[PDB]
Design a protein around this ligand. Structure first.
Ligand SMILES: Nc1ncnc2c1ncn2[C@@H]1O[C@H](COP(=O)(O)OP(=O)(O)OP(=O)(O)O)[C@@H](O)[C@H]1O
Ligand SMILES: Nc1ncnc2c1ncn2[C@@H]1O[C@H](COP(=O)(O)OP(=O)(O)OP(=O)(O)O)[C@@H](O)[C@H]1O
Ligand SMILES: Nc1ncnc2c1ncn2[C@@H]1O[C@H](COP(=O)(O)OP(=O)(O)OP(=O)(O)O)[C@@H](O)[C@H]1O
Ligand SMILES: Nc1ncnc2c1ncn2[C@@H]1O[C@H](COP(=O)(O)OP(=O)(O)OP(=O)(O)O)[C@@H](O)[C@H]1O
Ligand SMILES: [Cl-]
Ligand SMILES: [Mg+2]
Ligand SMILES: [Mg+2]
Ligand SMILES: [Mg+2]
Ligand SMILES: [Mg+2]
Lengths: 265, 266
């Protein structure tokens, strides 16, 4: 069921293979209730992840503007204890970052053992906007996708469990959400009219997003998450993360004392 | 029990016994929780303005003993903020590399950027707390480190980092009940170490060194002593402290370079 959103290995896909506005037959109220119940489970499993200190989880969120990366971090990553989470929001590369290979700044933020890392935007930006606006060509993009895959294989072998999530919104949904930034004086700061050129290039972005999804493997899957309904985005992401953590199955560590014997004065 | 009653006024002498560990301001748990919920929305609005403005930052330092509520305060109150605007650092025992530098080197690295709320779960004060109790530094070195801490805070203040230091004030009996609950719950044994009960036996030495630390309280960089036996009351008071700081900072949404009513989205 959630697995219907997993990009299966070894076959290219089209973003239009998935609807942008699924609800799995649930009411918003039912979905939000389930999300709240999942939050408690996410917290217990993340506490076990940290206590164990042998494994880590890396969620990569990659999506167009207004698709809900920020909201998903707030609502779903907010279920975890913030002491066991590292969030990085990757913005335009600095001069220093540009003077290195494109994974230098990405690798530095990979999570330590016991932690959940979150990448709001990621190494995939280096094969997304860069291709649409012709800063790299297809041969370079192919090389970078291979290097991305090798990087993910390296983290997997380090017991970093990788989950990549594409938040799938329709162009009309994006347009409503952007218009809502223009209409709210508290949100103008968040709206850049120069960014509207990206909408003119919507299909070109589909094209390069579809190539990014080709790094989906059994060990490092991409999920296409219908995100027009923000509550359903949060519900599906909660299941994805909880499924990952249950499969990682981190255990509380052995202790070197007998608790029944301890006397607190 | 009004919020400025919890501020450590500037001066040379601080006594933790001046504050109770279990204030409730006359509120029930349900009333206080309702008020904390209302304040969360205001915290989120002001932190968005802080970020959008990009001129100032907020640095909350939480410094308290085990089971006093640092973790829970970060979860409940710092959780009101958009996490994209928050940078949390939990300072643990210094690594060999950290120890080969001055004691503020690893602290300064984590100071917040403009637009951000930084949270230190433990802080530069650790270097004049546990290190004193167990005789790794003497008093003369502790006094010199307190001076360097004050200078460091003055530097951040002059960079428009608003510094708020919070001591979570719990009673020994409340701490005992909370530590017993870790023992009683198999899912919490991993964060109970019997070795740490030595710190409880040094409760008064820790009072002494905390009271010295609290003398860095200034009008620009205040300490607050937050009665934290009631976890809901801790969260309520902390929410008010942070909200009062943000409102005084008064971050403004920035001027924009376009007219919104003329933009036509296609
Ligand atoms: N490797 C990269 N190369 C070029 N641009 C990048 C790279 N990584 C991130 N960026 C850009 O940095 C910008 C960050 O902008 P900002 O923080 O304002 O959020 P945003 O514009 O809302 O981002 P998004 O369009 O993903 O929602 C995004 O446009 C993103 O595409
Ligand atoms: N500068 C420092 N020098 C020595 N020890 C430090 C320093 N900074 C932090 N520590 C110690 O690192 C330890 C962190 O241990 P841990 O993450 O297990 O949390 P904890 O034991 O619950 O901390 P706390 O007693 O503050 O609640 C704390 O005991 C703290 O005192
Ligand atoms: N669920 C969790 N996820 C990630 N880290 C955690 C979690 N629970 C505890 N920790 C870390 O483990 C250490 C011991 O936890 P503890 O419950 O003592 O929290 P704390 O931050 O020291 O707060 P307190 O003031 O209540 O002691 C702390 O370093 C804390 O950050
Ligand atoms: N309240 C906030 N506090 C801190 N940073 C914020 C806040 N709101 C937005 N940002 C940052 O500003 C930028 C633009 O915000 P935006 O709402 O587009 O978020 P986003 O993460 O790009 O998510 P989306 O997929 O919805 O575009 C992002 O870089 C985001 O991290
Ligand atoms: Cl010194
Ligand atoms: Mg955006
Ligand atoms: Mg943009
Ligand atoms: Mg503790
Ligand atoms: Mg301890």
């Amino acid at each position: 069921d959630i697995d219907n959103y997993r990009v299966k290995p070894g076959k290219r896909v089209k973003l239009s293979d998935w609807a942008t506005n699924d609800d799995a037959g649930l009411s918003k109220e039912e979905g939000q209730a389930q999300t709240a119940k999942l939050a408690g489970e996410l917290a217990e499993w993340q506490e076990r992840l940290y206590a164990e200190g042998k494994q880590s989880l890396l969620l990569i969120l990659q999506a167009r503007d207004a698709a809900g990366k920020d909201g998903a971090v707030k609502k779903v990553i907010g279920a975890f204890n913030p002491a066991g989470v590292q969030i990085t929001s990757f913005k335009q590369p600095s001069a220093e970052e540009l003077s290195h290979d494109f994974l230098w700044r990405i690798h530095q933020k990979a999570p330590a053992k016991g932690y959940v890392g979150v990448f709001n935007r990621s190494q995939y930006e280096d094969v997304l906007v860069t291709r649409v606006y012709d800063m790299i060509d297809d041969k370079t993009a192919k090389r970078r996708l291979e290097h991305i895959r090798h990087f993910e294989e390296l983290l997997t072998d380090n017991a970093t469990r990788i989950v990549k999530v594409y938040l799938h919104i329709s162009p009309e949904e994006q347009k409503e959400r952007l218009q809502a930034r223009l209409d709210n004086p508290g949100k103008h700061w968040k709206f850049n009219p120069g960014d509207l050129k990206d909408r003119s290039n919507w299909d070109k972005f589909n094209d390069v997003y579809e190539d990014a999804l080709t790094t989906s493997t059994d060990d490092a899957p991409w999920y296409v998450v219908p995100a027009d309904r923000k509550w359903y985005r949060d519900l599906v992401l909660s299941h994805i993360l909880l499924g990952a953590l249950k499969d990682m199955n981190p255990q509380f560590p052995a202790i070197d004392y007998d608790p029944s014997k301890v006397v607190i004065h």
